[PDB]
Amino acid sequence: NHYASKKSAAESMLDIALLMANASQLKAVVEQGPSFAFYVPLVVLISISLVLQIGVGVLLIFLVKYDLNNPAKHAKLDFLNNLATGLVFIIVVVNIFITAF
Amino acid sequence: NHYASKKSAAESMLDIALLMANASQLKAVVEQGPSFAFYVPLVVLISISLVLQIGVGVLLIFLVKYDLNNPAKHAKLDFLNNLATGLVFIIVVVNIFITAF
Amino acid sequence: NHYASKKSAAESMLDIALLMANASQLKAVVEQGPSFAFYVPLVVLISISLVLQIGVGVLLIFLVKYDLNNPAKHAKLDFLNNLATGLVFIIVVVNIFITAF
Amino acid sequence: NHYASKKSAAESMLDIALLMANASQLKAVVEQGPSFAFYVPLVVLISISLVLQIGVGVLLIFLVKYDLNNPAKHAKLDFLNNLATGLVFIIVVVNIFITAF
Amino acid sequence: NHYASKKSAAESMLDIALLMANASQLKAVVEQGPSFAFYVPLVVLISISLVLQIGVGVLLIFLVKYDLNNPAKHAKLDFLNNLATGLVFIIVVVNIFITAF
Amino acid sequence: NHYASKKSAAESMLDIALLMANASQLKAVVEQGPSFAFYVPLVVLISISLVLQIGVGVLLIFLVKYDLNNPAKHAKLDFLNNLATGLVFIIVVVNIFITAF
Ligand SMILES: CC(C)CCC[C@@H](C)[C@H]1CC[C@H]2[C@@H]3CC=C4C[C@@H](O)CC[C@]4(C)[C@H]3CC[C@]12C
Ligand SMILES: CC(C)CCC[C@@H](C)[C@H]1CC[C@H]2[C@@H]3CC=C4C[C@@H](O)CC[C@]4(C)[C@H]3CC[C@]12C
Ligand SMILES: CC(C)CCC[C@@H](C)[C@H]1CC[C@H]2[C@@H]3CC=C4C[C@@H](O)CC[C@]4(C)[C@H]3CC[C@]12C
Numbered sequence: 001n002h003y004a005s006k007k008s009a010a011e012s013m014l015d016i017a018l019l020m021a022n023a024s025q026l027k028a029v030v031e032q033g034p035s036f037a038f039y040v041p042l043v044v045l046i047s048i049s050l051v052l053q054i055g056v057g058v059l060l061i062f063l064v065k066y067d068l069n070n071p072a073k074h075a076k077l078d079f080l081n082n083l084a085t086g087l088v089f090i091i092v093v094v095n096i097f098i099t100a101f
Numbered sequence: 102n103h104y105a106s107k108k109s110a111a112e113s114m115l116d117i118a119l120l121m122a123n124a125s126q127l128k129a130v131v132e133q134g135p136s137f138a139f140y141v142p143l144v145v146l147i148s149i150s151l152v153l154q155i156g157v158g159v160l161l162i163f164l165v166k167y168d169l170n171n172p173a174k175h176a177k178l179d180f181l182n183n184l185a186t187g188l189v190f191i192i193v194v195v196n197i198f199i200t201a202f
Numbered sequence: 203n204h205y206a207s208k209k210s211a212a213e214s215m216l217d218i219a220l221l222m223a224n225a226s227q228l229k230a231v232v233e234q235g236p237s238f239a240f241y242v243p244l245v246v247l248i249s250i251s252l253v254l255q256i257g258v259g260v261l262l263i264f265l266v267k268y269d270l271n272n273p274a275k276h277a278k279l280d281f282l283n284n285l286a287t288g289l290v291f292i293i294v295v296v297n298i299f300i301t302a303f
Numbered sequence: 304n305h306y307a308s309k310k311s312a313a314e315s316m317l318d319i320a321l322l323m324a325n326a327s328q329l330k331a332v333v334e335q336g337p338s339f340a341f342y343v344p345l346v347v348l349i350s351i352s353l354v355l356q357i358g359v360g361v362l363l364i365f366l367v368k369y370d371l372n373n374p375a376k377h378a379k380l381d382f383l384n385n386l387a388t389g390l391v392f393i394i395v396v397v398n399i400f401i402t403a404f
Numbered sequence: 405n406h407y408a409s410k411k412s413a414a415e416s417m418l419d420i421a422l423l424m425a426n427a428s429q430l431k432a433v434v435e436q437g438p439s440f441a442f443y444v445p446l447v448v449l450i451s452i453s454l455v456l457q458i459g460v461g462v463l464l465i466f467l468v469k470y471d472l473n474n475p476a477k478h479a480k481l482d483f484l485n486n487l488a489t490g491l492v493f494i495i496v497v498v499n500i501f502i503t504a505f
Numbered sequence: 506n507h508y509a510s511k512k513s514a515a516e517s518m519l520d521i522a523l524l525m526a527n528a529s530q531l532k533a534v535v536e537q538g539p540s541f542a543f544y545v546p547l548v549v550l551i552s553i554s555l556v557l558q559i560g561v562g563v564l565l566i567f568l569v570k571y572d573l574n575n576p577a578k579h580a581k582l583d584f585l586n587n588l589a590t591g592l593v594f595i596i597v598v599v600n601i602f603i604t605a606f
């Protein structure tokens with residue numbers, strides 16, 4: 001099976017529990033309604049968190065391939081790693097505030 | 102039997118359990134009625150998910166052929182693998198939200 | 203007997219068990235009546251699958267002849283195999299939905 | 304402006320007048336209601352017609368490539384032209400019935 | 405415009421006045437209902453007539469291409485022309501009966 | 506000023522009048538209410554169109570640099586151009602359907 005091989009290499013560029021955690025709390029706040037406090041900050045915090053994770057996922061997909069095919073661009077490769085590290089860093093900050101609120 | 106060989110080679114370019122999972126809940130949400138909540142997001146999420154899987158399968162069918170007949174275009178083949186990985190990646194992200202909602 | 207030889211070679215160009223499977227539900231959905239839910243999506247889904255199986259079978263009949271008589275046109279023969287695989291891939295996707303619905 | 308250059312090349316691979324004609328009548332039949340006759344055959348005919356135009360467009364987009372970059376694979380190139388011609392041939396036949404109904 | 409060129413090339417493989425006539429009378433007999441006599445023969449004759457025209461059109465698309473790319477197989481091309489001529493012969497015979505009834 | 510040059514180089518990578526059109530129609534459909542018909546298809550089509558426009562903008566931003574610094578990999582650049590053309594094709598189809606509805 002070729003799709004399973006693609007699926008295995010596609011789940012290796014992200015985590016599963018956090019999106020399941022993110023989706024479950026996004027679902028809970030939606031049904032409760034705008035009457036509940038912190039509705040507006042929670043929706044935007046989840047939305048920006050999901051977008052950043054998607055951007056990191058596509059970033060990681062195209063990054064590990066440079067680790068094998070052509071590592072000549074030593075300077076460029078490190079800068080991409082730091083950007084991925086920084087994007088994950090801001091992701092966990094939103095998740096810290098999401099759980100707190 | 103020549104059709105059996107085609108079916109085996111075409112069933113190996115995708116997964117089956119996920120497609121039945123999408124179709125089973127698609128019937129459930131459609132027959133349940135628009136009155137129940139999350140009807141609209143589930144319908145569009147399943148619809149876009151199914152469309153991408155067809156595109157991935159079509160992408161994969163024309164992909165494994167180049168792995169044997171002519172591997173000279175390494176750059177084009179390597180990028181095509183990355184695009185397939187990204188499309189599968191966004192499929193599992195949508196599927197995570199479908200089960201949650 | 204020459205017709206028996208043609209029948210054997212023509213039955214190898216398609217699958218058999220699925221055909222009565224498609225035919226049996228087509229009779230059931232037609233006999234039960236339009237009042238039964240999901241009637242309309244069932245007829246079109248069965249109809250398109252039946253049309254595509256005929257196209258695939260016709261494609262398979264004219265394809266194996268080139269495999270022995272004249273295999274020089276490798277590029278054209280290779281693409282025909284991919285088209286046959288892609289067409290069958292649509293068949294398996296569609297049949298999943300009739301089974302689910 | 305680079306986007307407009309892409310748009311000009313992308314509009315050269317399809318027709319606009321038929322698409323608005325298909326979309327205008329799709330809106331009319333949908334908004335009119337299922338009470339009027341020929342509701343279903345019109346919807347499925349437009350739907351299969353619309354899918355084929357997208358399939359023709361992507362076929363034509365990747366077909367202009369081979370006429371200039373590498374015309375060495377002639378036999379594959381002529382066959383792809385016939386498939387592109389065949390796909391459009393079905394589209395006009397379908398549109399004839401849409402106009403009549 | 406490349407789609408217009410394909411449409412023009414696919415327009416030369418069939419006629420318009422006959423298809424619109426067939427579709428117009430198909431709508432008339434269908435709307436009137438089975439109460440009006442000759443309903444069953446009219447539907448089947450129009451149905452088989454339309455099927456052959458698509459087969460003739462697809463036949464003509466793949467036939468004129470051999471007239472220019474590779475005319476070496478004169479014997480096979482001659483037989484194909486007779487089949488196309490024969491297929492048109494039954495089409496015009498069938499259409500005579502549709503007008504008569 | 507260095508920010509003005511970046512603004513010009515970023516505005517040259519996309520079309521703007523379509524952006525005011527999309528924003529205005531989105532505001533209209535959002536404000537006038539869900540009671541209006543075609544509300545949901547309009548909203549989802551506008552959303553996917555905007556997402557695709559951002560994707561095309563990013564593609565063009567990262568592709569224009571590739572045209573000058575290192576043109577050695579012709580195949581990858583040409584395939585990226587084809588992908589951008591197809592994305593603009595689907596964007597213009599979605600915008601046609603938005604205008605129709
Ligand atoms: C804009 C930032 C802050 C968030 C969004 C990030 C996403 C959409 C973008 C921004 C930077 C982009 C990367 C920039 C450079 C490269 C190197 C190239 O050879 C492969 C693609 C890759 C790896 C890009 C992938 C997409 C990318 C990760
Ligand atoms: C339009 C994109 C974003 C989503 C839909 C993907 C489908 C419709 C398209 C987009 C990319 C396409 C592929 C791009 C390149 C090639 C290499 C060619 O030698 C065989 C076909 C193949 C493999 C194409 C098949 C069709 C394809 C898979
Ligand atoms: C039109 C498409 C999308 C669906 C219908 C498929 C049928 C009607 C058509 C489309 C492509 C066609 C094939 C194209 C090329 C050849 C190779 C030739 O040596 C024998 C006929 C054969 C094998 C054709 C048989 C009929 C065929 C299979």
Ligand SMILES: CC(C)CCC[C@@H](C)[C@H]1CC[C@H]2[C@@H]3CC=C4C[C@@H](O)CC[C@]4(C)[C@H]3CC[C@]12C
Nearest residue numbers: 159163288289358359361362363365366369383
């Ligand atoms: C599945 C068929 C019957 C209908 C849908 C057609 C679309 C989705 C598919 C089927 C055949 C495909 C083409 C097959 C071969 C080529 C030649 C290659 O150099 C570029 C991609 C291109 C041009 C593909 C693009 C996508 C394509 C046009």
Ligand SMILES: CC(C)CCC[C@@H](C)[C@H]1CC[C@H]2[C@@H]3CC=C4C[C@@H](O)CC[C@]4(C)[C@H]3CC[C@]12C
Nearest residue numbers: 260264459460462463464465466467470484491
């Ligand atoms: C079976 C007959 C009586 C009716 C149906 C006709 C259609 C479906 C079939 C039957 C014979 C077929 C043709 C047989 C041989 C060729 C020559 C080849 O170079 C291109 C395809 C082409 C032109 C085929 C196209 C499809 C075709 C015309």
Ligand SMILES: CC(C)CCC[C@@H](C)[C@H]1CC[C@H]2[C@@H]3CC=C4C[C@@H](O)CC[C@]4(C)[C@H]3CC[C@]12C
Nearest residue numbers: 058062187188560561563564565567568571585
């Ligand atoms: C996922 C696809 C189908 C739609 C979304 C497109 C965006 C998110 C992605 C997918 C393809 C990506 C591009 C793929 C390849 C390259 C070439 C490199 O030199 C610069 C980055 C660039 C240009 C990427 C930028 C980000 C990109 C445009």
